[PDB]
Amino acid sequence: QPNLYLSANAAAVYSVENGEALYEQNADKVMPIASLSKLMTAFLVLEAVDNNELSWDEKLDLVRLDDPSAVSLYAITQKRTWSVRDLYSAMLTMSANDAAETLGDRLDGADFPKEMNNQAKKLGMSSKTTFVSASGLDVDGKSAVSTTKDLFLLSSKLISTHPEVLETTSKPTVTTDKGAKLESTNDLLGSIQGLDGLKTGFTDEAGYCFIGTAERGGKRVISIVLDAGTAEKRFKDTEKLMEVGFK
Numbered sequence: 410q411p412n413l414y415l416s417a418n419a420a421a422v423y424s425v426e427n428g429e430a431l432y433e434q435n436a437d438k439v440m441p442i443a444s445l446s447k448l449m450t451a452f453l454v455l456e457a458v459d460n461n462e463l464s465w466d467e468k469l470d471l472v473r474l475d476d477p478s479a480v481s482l483y484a485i486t487q488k489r490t491w492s493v494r495d496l497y498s499a500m501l502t503m504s505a506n507d508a509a510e511t512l513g514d515r516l517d518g519a520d521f522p523k524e525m526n527n528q529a530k531k532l533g534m535s536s537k538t539t540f541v542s543a544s545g546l547d548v549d550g551k552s553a554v555s556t557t558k559d560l561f562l563l564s565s566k567l568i569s570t571h572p573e574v575l576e577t578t579s580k581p582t583v584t585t586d587k588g589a590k591l592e593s594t595n596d597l598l599g600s601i602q603g604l605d606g607l608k609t610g611f612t613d614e615a616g617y618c619f620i621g622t623a624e625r626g627g628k629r630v631i632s633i634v635l636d637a638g639t640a641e642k643r644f645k646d647t648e649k650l651m652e653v654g655f656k
């Protein structure tokens with residue numbers, strides 16, 4: 410294993426072909442993951458469409474967040490009603506917390522965190538992973554937590570089960586049918602060849618986090634960065650991890 414000098418406190422990169430570690434640092438350490446939880450919500454949304462339980466065209470009113478200063482789709486647009494499709498894009502591109510919570514409530518109401526943790530178990534994530542909400546926001550003072558190993562297993566399961574997730578996470582901007590522009594938080598899109606995902610997150614406690622995925626020559630790698638120092642440094646660590654991934 411090479412010696413990287415990452416900003417991140419915990420980090421890794423894995424090959425999807427065999428799941429094997431190409432670089433690992435604190436890969437078993439339980440870490441706050443915040444907005445990365447929205448990948449589980451996306452997965453459960455996609456499962457529900459395949460299972461004939463959710464329509465992409467259903468219109469839903471955004472649920473109201475307790476904190477106004479939270480990053481929310483409603484704050485930016487002043488529009489309450491959105492299709493399931495647009496809420497899912499809004500969740501994945503701009504990390505809209507109210508979008509994620511609206512999808513969680515529609516899927517299972519108050520039991521949605523249990524469904525998230527049920528699915529975590531199905532996908533092979535260890536018991537150190539705990540989801541608390543569809544958006545990744547704290548609930549009753551409890552935080553969503555995971556490990557870079559469990560995040561890898563979740564991400565590759567998401568991409569292998571629902572490859573169309575990347576059709577959304579590869580776009581620097583998603584334009585809805587009615588013309589709303591939803592800007593991705595993934596500034597590495599277009600900077601690294603093959604890069605088409607996956608999800609950013611940030612809290613004071615979690616630091617700056619990003620799950621990256623790229624594919625070249627039939628080889629896919631997934632990179633995990635938790636608790637980088639700045640929004641830019643999580644992408645610098647990811648650039649470093651991707652080079653190790655495609656060596």
Ligand SMILES: *C(=O)[C@@H](NC(=O)/C(=N/OC)c1csc(N)n1)[C@@H]1N=C(C(=O)O)C(=C)CS1
Nearest residue numbers: 443444445480503504594609610611612613
């Ligand atoms: C996911 O992590 C989201 N993070 C939050 O909603 C925050 N939670 O703190 C309790 C938060 C605090 S401060 C701040 N700017 N967000 C989304 N993650 C980011 C990101 O990756 O930088 C977004 C740009 C919107 S919120």
